[PDB]
Symmetry: C2
Subunit: 100 residues, 2 copies
């Protein structure tokens, strides 16, 4: 229930949706796959520092949130694999607010 945990949980969700997206979406472009792929790895970093309750986690969360919304913008779509990703990214960005 703690803000770090809620943010870590959201990061995990962003990771799944992102990896599923670039793995399953057959209509994605290079640009979109680069956005979803980098967003997955960035959220990985954030979740890892959130878990260890690192004093540097917020700095990593800021960067991840910055590109997570950029991914939500480029990957959003009406298709399930597209909205799940974009949504998870939005939710993660939202969870970072209290930690900044």
């Amino acid at each position: 229930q703690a803000p770090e945990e809620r943010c870590r949980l959201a990061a995990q969700a962003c990771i799944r949706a992102c990896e599923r997206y670039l793995a399953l979406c057959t209509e994605s472009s290079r640009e979109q796959r680069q956005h979803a792929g980098d967003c997955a790895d960035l959220c990985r970093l954030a979740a890892l520092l959130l878990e260890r309750r690192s004093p540097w986690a917020p700095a990593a969360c800021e960067l991840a949130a910055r590109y997570a919304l950029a991914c939500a913008e480029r990957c959003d779509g009406d298709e399930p694999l597209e909205r799940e990703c974009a949504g998870a990214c939005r939710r993660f960005v939202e969870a970072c607010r209290p930690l900044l």
Copy 2:
């Protein structure tokens, strides 16, 4: 290529930090946090450099700033302490051309 040089230095920094937090026996809690976080930061940067991502520089700037912080607190006279800081600063300087 400057990216390859930077990724290569990031890889070495990851190696150094890990050997430190795993083998050093004099490290404090804060030094372990610094070394571990620096390892993860350089990891993320290495991944973006591998795929030649346009977001690699932003990630390198973040790893660099904390990599040098890890070198400032972890440096020592023991081989693993000195290699950790040297590897960190080497990664940083290799980031310059990308930042």
